[PDB]
């Protein structure tokens, strides 16, 4: 599977029939139909003790990986019961500024989308968590092109060292708090991984406020490669799944 004409999202259901399931992601967030839920709690993002370790080009995106062997960087509150540990973040982005996000807002596509991936500590590790309907919490943050995001620059500047699939680099002491917008207002709904195996294990928490990144920052994302070293160059762009049917789900808003 990938994002090309012959192996992209429209083909995934052949290997992963859950692609046509009842709680697939991403979705379009219709802002007028989302309902304010006053029982939703503020999000608690506790990233002060985060320990980043490594950055990896996995052939579909790049992951910044964290030490998740202790409760060092955790997400709690909001719609969540219990404690969810940060394991990695990554992005999805476009070939052009007019596309790239997975979720859309009133059909608007952003230039990119950041996914901060967390697993429910009651399941012991990530591999067990993805087998559970409440196993993961993914915090999604839209990126628009405008001013630079200073806290993203350290990520941008290492990408030259992980150009191709399978390359990794040490990436310690990175603070993911520098990727957050000011407001933690959010929408939430039950969904899935947006990549094969498309497991229906995610509580999605999508922030209303985008972050701004510069044109030069996103252009550096677009220099990455899907291919391995010594294979024909295929730029890593348009690594996003389009919006899927909402089916029998309601999107809830934390804000009026
Ligand atoms: C493809 N693999 C490897 C993988 C292989 C087999 C089983 C489980 C996982 C992923 O882990 N993907 C992933 C993980 C978390 C979040 C998101 S996302 N984009 O929904 O935030 C995508
Ligand atoms: Zn993702």
Question: Which of 101, 117, 242 is the pocket-test mutation for ligand 1 (most atoms within 8 Å of CB)?
Answer: 117
> Which long-range contacts does 62-66 make (Cβ < 8 Å, 24+ apart)?
62/90, 62/91, 62/159, 62/162, 62/224, 63/88, 63/89, 63/90, 64/88, 64/89, 64/90, 64/155, 64/171, 64/174, 64/176, 65/171
| Structural resolution in Å | 1.3
Nearest CA to ligand 1 atom 17: 193
Query: In angstroms, what is the span from residue 256 Cα to ligand 1's centroid?
Result: 32
> What is the number of the ligand 1 atom nearest to the C-alpha of 130?
8
Structure tokens at 254: 């934390």
CA distances from 97 to 14, 89, 101, 216 (A): 31, 21, 10, 11
d(C-alpha 122, C-alpha 42), whole Å: 21
* CA within 13 Å, CB half, 130: 12
Is residue 13 a known part of a binding site?
Answer: no
Q: Is the peptide bond before 26 cis (omega within 30 degrees of 0)?
A: yes
d(C-alpha 144, C-alpha 65), whole Å: 24
| Residue pair 205/186 in contact by the 8 Å Cβ criterion | yes
- Give ligand 1 pocket residues (Cβ under 6 A): 115, 117, 130, 138, 193-195, 197
Among residues 79, 98, 96, the alpha carbon closest in space to that of 138 is found at 79
Residue 32 annotated among the catalytic residues of the structure? no
Is residue 195 a known part of a binding site?
Answer: yes
**Exposure b/e, 92-116, CB count within 10 A at least 16 = b:** bbbeebebbbbbbbeeebbbbbbbb
Is residue 115 a known part of a binding site?
Answer: yes
d(C-alpha 199, C-alpha 193), whole Å: 6
Nearest CA to ligand 1 atom 7: 197
Chain centroid, CA 20 distance in Å? 20
| Residue pair 223/159 in contact by the 8 Å Cβ criterion | yes
Is residue 6 a known part of a binding site?
Answer: no
Which entry of 11, 32, 60, 118 is annotated as an active-site residue?
A: 60
Task: Read off φ and ψ for residue 186, nearest 5 degrees.
Answer: -150, 160
Strand pairing partners for 92? 113
Structure tokens at 210: 């985008």
Query: In angstroms, what is the span from residue 58 Cα to ligand 1's centroid?
Result: 11
Q: Is the peptide bond before 116 cis (omega within 30 degrees of 0)?
A: no
Domain ranges within the chain, ordered by starting residue:
1-256
Nearest CA to ligand 1 atom 21: 115
Which ligand sits nearest to residue 244's alpha carbon? 1
């Amino acid at each position: 599977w990938g994002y090309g004409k012959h192996n992209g999202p429209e083909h995934w259901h052949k290997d992963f029939p859950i692609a046509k399931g009842e709680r697939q992601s991403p979705v379009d967030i219709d802002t007028h139909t989302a309902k304010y839920d006053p029982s939703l709690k503020p999000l608690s993002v506790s990233y002060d003790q985060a320990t980043s370790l490594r950055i990896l080009n996995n052939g579909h995106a790049f992951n910044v990986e964290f030490d998740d062997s202790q409760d060092k960087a955790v997400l709690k509150g909001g719609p969540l019961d219990g404690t969810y540990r940060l394991i990695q973040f990554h992005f999805h982005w476009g070939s052009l500024d007019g596309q790239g996000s997975e979720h859309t807002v009133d059909k608007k596509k952003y230039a990119a989308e950041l996914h901060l991936v967390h697993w429910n500590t009651k399941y012991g590790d990530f591999g067990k968590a993805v087998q559970q309907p409440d196993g993961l919490a993914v915090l999604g943050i839209f990126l628009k092109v405008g001013s630079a995001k200073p806290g993203l620059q350290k990520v941008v500047d290492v990408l030259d060292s992980i150009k191709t699939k399978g390359k990794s680099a040490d990436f310690t002491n990175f603070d993911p708090r520098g990727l957050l917008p000011e407001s933690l207002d959010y929408w939430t709904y039950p969904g899935s991984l947006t990549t094969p195996p498309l497991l229906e294990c995610v509580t999605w928490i999508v922030l209303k406020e985008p972050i701004s990144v510069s044109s030069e920052q996103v252009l550096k994302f677009r220099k990455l490669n899907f291919n391995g070293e010594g294979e024909p160059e295929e730029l890593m762009v348009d690594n996003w799944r389009p919006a899927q049917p909402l089916k029998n789900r309601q999107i809830k808003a934390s804000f009026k």
